[PDB]
Ligand binder design. Structure first.
Ligand SMILES: *C(=O)[C@@H](NC(=O)Cc1ccccc1)[C@@H]1N[C@@H](C(=O)O)C(C)(C)S1
Length: 257
């Protein structure tokens, strides 16, 4: 309804899935439509690693070489020939959307093929990781590669983080990164009521103005999060997104709760 209106105001396509984990209440709009998840996949990879490595053991270091470095790695770019702890990899991936950190997290997990296995165990047969960064960012409406539906992606985010194989410490370390992430400030954070806490991970693919934001939103007073997945995109390959679209979509969706 009003989301269709926002699709008209911004000449864009909105994908929404939101789940209040307390009530089990869901808001869906183009929720079974495929979108490039882009960097929002970093939250998923980070959480999967965290299921396998206890907080105390995030101090394990791993070697970084030139072959590991991919574009848009503001943190990892300085670790060629150096060691980095898994904790700092996760921090890089989440806070700076470091692409090299995210690939190394997927490697730690055991590779794309293992992320796929985990996804399927969580009943997610939609989220479709195929490539590492940055190649996963070359979205095409014609390919399913590195795409998901807001519903499949949110359900996974809910089963992985919102409840709940993560220890209290690993769950806190991930969510704090997401809460403290100043790079998602123009998205969901921008549209939610100022007293709501928002723990997000944003994404922007190279093509079709694919701009996304996923978050754990805590309406003031509630501790149970509302999982919010907003995927947007446009008709043209070189289209530039408008973050206000996501900000407005989040505002609208939050009234439903
Ligand atoms: C996650 O979505 C990452 N996206 C890319 O690596 C592709 C890309 C898209 C637009 C500009 C540059 C690179 C990260 N998200 C972007 C972004 O927010 O635009 C980063 C440049 C932070 S990498």
């Amino acid at each position: 309804k009003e989301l269709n209106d926002l699709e008209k105001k911004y000449n864009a396509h909105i994908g929404v899935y939101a789940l209040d984990t307390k009530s089990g209440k869901e808001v869906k709009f183009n929720s079974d439509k495929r979108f490039a998840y882009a960097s929002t996949s970093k939250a998923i990879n980070s959480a999967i690693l965290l299921e396998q490595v206890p907080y105390n053991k995030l101090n394990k270091k791993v070697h970084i070489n030139k072959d590991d470095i991919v574009a848009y790695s503001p943190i990892l770019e300085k670790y060629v020939g150096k060691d980095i702890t898994l904790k700092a990899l996760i921090e890089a991936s989440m806070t700076y959307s470091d692409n090299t950190a995210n690939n190394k997290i997927i490697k730690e997990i055991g590779g794309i093929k293992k992320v796929k296995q985990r996804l399927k165990e969580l009943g997610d047969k939609v989220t479709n990781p195929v490539r590492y960064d940055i190649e996963l960012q070359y979205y095409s409406p014609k390919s399913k590669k590195d795409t998901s539906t807001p519903a499949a992606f949110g359900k996974t985010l809910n089963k992985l983080i919102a409840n709940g194989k993560l220890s209290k410490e690993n769950k806190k370390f991930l969510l704090d990164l997401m809460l403290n992430n100043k790079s998602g400030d123009t998205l969901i954070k921008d549209g939610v009521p100022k007293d709501y806490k928002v723990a997000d991970k944003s994404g922007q693919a190279i093509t079709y103005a694919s701009r996304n934001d996923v978050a754990f939103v805590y309406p003031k007073g509630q501790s149970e999060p509302i999982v919010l997945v907003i995927f947007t995109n446009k008709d043209n390959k070189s289209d530039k997104p408008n973050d206000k679209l996501i900000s407005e979509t989040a505002k609208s969706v939050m009234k439903e709760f």
